Design a protein around this ligand. Structure first.
Ligand SMILES: OC[C@H]1O[C@@](CO)(O[C@H]2O[C@H](CO)[C@@H](O)[C@H](O)[C@H]2O)[C@@H](O)[C@@H]1O
Ligand SMILES: *C/C=C(\C)CC/C=C(\C)CC/C=C(\C)CCC=C(C)C
Ligand SMILES: [Zn+2]
Lengths: 4, 315, 410
């Protein structure tokens, strides 16, 4: 789950 | 040359060819917050990255360094940016770099920077020849990798490679017809090629989707695609569809079907349909059924629909 | 009714069994994975039932507080992968404490301030760590963290003049924004930009020219919003898009009807939580990305004078979401997570709590209606649906900055  | 995990790897602080430059420690201040207890190796590479960056050293040694910084943390966008600056300044072989990124992406396919890097490389070389095959491999490992699909859409649209995508779409839908990313790609390919205004195309699509719905009645993707390709024009514009669904209801009264029916009634009531009172009544009965029994998790949504229908068509 | 020591749960009703997956005897990777999770979640659910005795659910506030308090200062090397996201770790952790109503010691607040100052770039904005180029992700985080602290010291750390210039250096002609110089483009950037721009009062008429149009182009056939025009509907990008348009007061540029029906369909009938995309697994962090959309929609519809809007509930299963978070998303050792079997992390902790707060609190006009499942102590502090920081914090910050002029503009 990476946001950036 | 040597990787961070190779037996012969040597910290940068111990490398003779790096002796001439002083490492720049990271300044977190006297009372650090969210302070990461880096490994000796990690800090070593970053202390030297900091140095080359500060000095803006466009060198082959710095370029090799970024490769190690990236392996330590591929999410560090600053490193990536500097790496591209070096690729240009040093006039590095971009095809060689493509092979690099290809490997990197294979290791970490859900990273934003790696994909952006590969897009820049393809822009610079104006060469997409390896794209579809590569992407297909990524998707073969994770059929729903978002970054993968996004990159694929970019390549297809930018270099106009539409010719075989619909086939690809069918292939994947056969593998997993529940793959929502694939139904999306389908809409992507059609809306951009033939469009959905060709009534022959629309019918083909409506048929195909109904056939998939019959094969797997609780697959929400198909249902969403059906409503998706017909919604703009208006669900009430397709009278035969309502009949067909009403015929299947007694045997397939899934929440999807019941919901689709309310969606149709909604649009009918919005277009001065005949037997307004009768349509409203059937719509409210379904909303109640969905709220109290067939789709209770969405009780509030349905209750709202019920009230909206009343505020719009009661008379 | 029931004695105060027993509280019936939606997830434990006998009829709730009917909500289990129906794979029509046609298995694919998707149904297989979905079935596995459901199997595990049923087990978890059952562990909270003792026939007709159903003890009140408890949010382990103290265990969470101690996990957070520790991370705010130090993090193992397992967080090396987030070295370019420290201001983000700051925001996650502080907002979590904020939600938990755990005060921030003056000393810690000042240390955080200094740290974020060290992350600010001279060209404006904030980077992932000291010396790192500026990036909207950490910029967004850094401003929210400073507003959660809410002191004039925190507020003044932001170099507003350069921040505006930085936003300008990322503006594309089609209305979109790069995430960082030479970086990638997608809807996250429009939401970061608008978030920080409106809070610090640095919005010019041209800053967001063509942005609302660009975001609308992102809503797709599904009704949700994708990262970029053409891509799949996704909870995270959808939260980004809507909240951005709410800031720009342009929600109308979207088909609110298709969007509403899309997001409500994203709550899992069995799990009680939200999936990020249709036909994908449930995940605690969407509890905010998805469920958070409802309050934004309610606000958007209410401004349009929708007579059928509820005056007491969000259009999703508030109780169900609370049961998923409380029984499936808590790590016994403290912190929250994706789903049972996953390990904790500050990201999930922040968002599971953010969603739990939205699920417990309803507000619209002069109307307030709380629904705190379990023991009363579970109640969390409210959160602003647009900025996801205390509502009080939002008001304080905007009031403060409204007092300063828009950098070099009239
Ligand atoms: O949810 C559909 C809704 O979205 C809009 C944009 O607000 O258009 C999207 O969906 C269409 C299919 O329904 C696509 O043709 C279009 O490209 C996509 O942006 C609205 O026009 C529509 O009502
Ligand atoms: C499992 C979770 C995944 C894959 C992530 C989905 C969520 C997204 C893309 C939200 C991104 C939001 C952004 C960039 C703005 C918010 C930034 C911060 C909280 C630092
Ligand atoms: Zn998650």
């Amino acid at each position: 789950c990476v946001l950036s | 040359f040597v990787s961070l995990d190779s037996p012969s790897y040597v910290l940068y602080r111990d490398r003779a060819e790096w002796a001439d430059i002083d490492p720049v420690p990271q300044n977190d201040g006297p009372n650090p917050v969210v302070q990461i207890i880096y490994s000796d190796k990690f800090r070593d590479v970053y202390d030297y990255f900091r140095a080359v960056l500060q000095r803006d050293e466009r060198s082959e040694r710095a370029f090799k360094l970024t490769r190690d910084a990236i392996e330590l943390n591929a999410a560090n966008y600053t490193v990536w940016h500097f790496r591209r600056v070096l690729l240009k300044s040093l006039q590095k072989d971009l095809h060689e770099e493509m092979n690099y990124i290809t490997a990197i992406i294979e290791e970490q396919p859900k990273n934003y920077q790696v994909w952006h890097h590969r897009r820049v490389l393809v822009e610079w070389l104006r060469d997409p020849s390896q794209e579809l095959e590569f992407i297909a491999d990524i998707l073969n490992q994770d059929a729903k990798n978002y970054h993968a699909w996004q990159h694929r859409q970019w390549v297809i649209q930018e270099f106009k490679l539409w010719d075989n995508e619909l086939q690809y779409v069918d292939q994947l839908l056969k593998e997993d017809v529940r793959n929502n990313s694939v139904w999306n790609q389908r809409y992507f390919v059609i809306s951009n090629t033939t469009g959905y205004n060709d009534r022959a195309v629309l019918e083909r699509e409506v048929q195909y989707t109904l056939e998939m719905i019959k094969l797997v009645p609780h697959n929400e993707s198909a249902w969403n695609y059906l409503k998706g390709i017909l919604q703009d024009r208006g669900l009430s514009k397709y009278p035969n569809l309502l009949n067909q669904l009403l015929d299947l209801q007694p045997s397939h009264s899934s929440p999807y079907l019941i919901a689709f029916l309310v969606d149709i009634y909604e649009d009918m009531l919005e277009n001065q349909c005949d037997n307004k009172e009768d349509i409203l009544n059937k719509a409210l009965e379904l909303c109640e059924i969905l709220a109290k029994e067939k789709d209770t998790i969405r009780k509030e949504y349905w209750r709202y629909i019920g009230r909206s229908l009343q505020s719009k068509h009661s008379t | 009714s029931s004695p105060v020591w027993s509280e019936p749960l939606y997830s434990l009703r006998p009829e709730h069994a009917r909500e289990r997956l129906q794979d029509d005897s046609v298995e694919t990777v998707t149904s297989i994975e979905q079935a596995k999770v459901e199997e595990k979640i049923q087990e978890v659910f059952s562990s909270y039932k003792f026939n007709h005795l159903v003890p009140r659910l408890v949010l382990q506030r103290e265990k969470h507080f101690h996990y957070l308090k520790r991370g705010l200062r130090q993090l193992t090397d397992a967080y090396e992968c987030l070295d370019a996201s420290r201001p983000t770790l700051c925001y996650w952790i502080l907002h979590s404490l904020e939600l938990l109503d755990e005060p921030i010691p003056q000393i810690v607040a000042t240390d955080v301030c200094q740290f974020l100052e060290l992350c600010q770039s001279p060209e404006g904005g904030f980077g992932g760590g000291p010396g790192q180029y500026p990036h909207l992700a950490p910029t967004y985080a850094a401003v929210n963290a400073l507003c959660i602290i809410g002191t004039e010291e925190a507020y003044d750390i932001i170099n507003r003049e350069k921040l505006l210039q930085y936003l300008y250096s990322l503006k594309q002609p089609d209305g979109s924004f790069l995430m960082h110089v030479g970086g990638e483009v997608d809807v996250r950037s429009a939401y970061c930009a608008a978030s920080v721009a409106s809070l610090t009062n640095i919005i010019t008429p041209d800053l967001f020219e063509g942005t609302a149009e660009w975001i609308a182009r992102c809503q797709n056939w599904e009704g949700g919003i994708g990262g970029v025009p053409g891509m799949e509907a996704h909870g995270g990008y959808t939260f980004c898009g809507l909240a951005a348009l709410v800031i720009l007061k342009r929600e109308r540029s979207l088909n609110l009807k298709s969007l509403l029906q899309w997001v409500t369909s994203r709550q899992m009938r069995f799990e009680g939580g939200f999936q990020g995309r249709c036909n994908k697994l449930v995940d605690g962090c969407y509890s905010f990305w998805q469920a958070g959309l409802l309050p934004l929609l309610h606000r958007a519809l209410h401004a349009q004078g929708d007579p059928a809007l509820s005056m007491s509930h969000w259009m999703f299963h508030q109780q169900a979401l609370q049961e998923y978070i409380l029984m499936c998303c808590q790590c016994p050792a403290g912190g929250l997570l994706d789903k049972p079997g996953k390990s904790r992390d500050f990201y999930h902790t922040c968002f599971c709590l953010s969603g739990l707060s939205i699920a417990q609190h309803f507000g619209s006009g002069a109307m307030l209606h709380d629904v705190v499942l379990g023991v009363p102590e579970n109640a969390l502090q409210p959160t602003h649906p647009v900025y996801n920081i205390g509502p009080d914090k939002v008001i304080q910050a905007t009031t403060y900055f409204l007092q300063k002029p828009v950098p070099g503009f009239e």
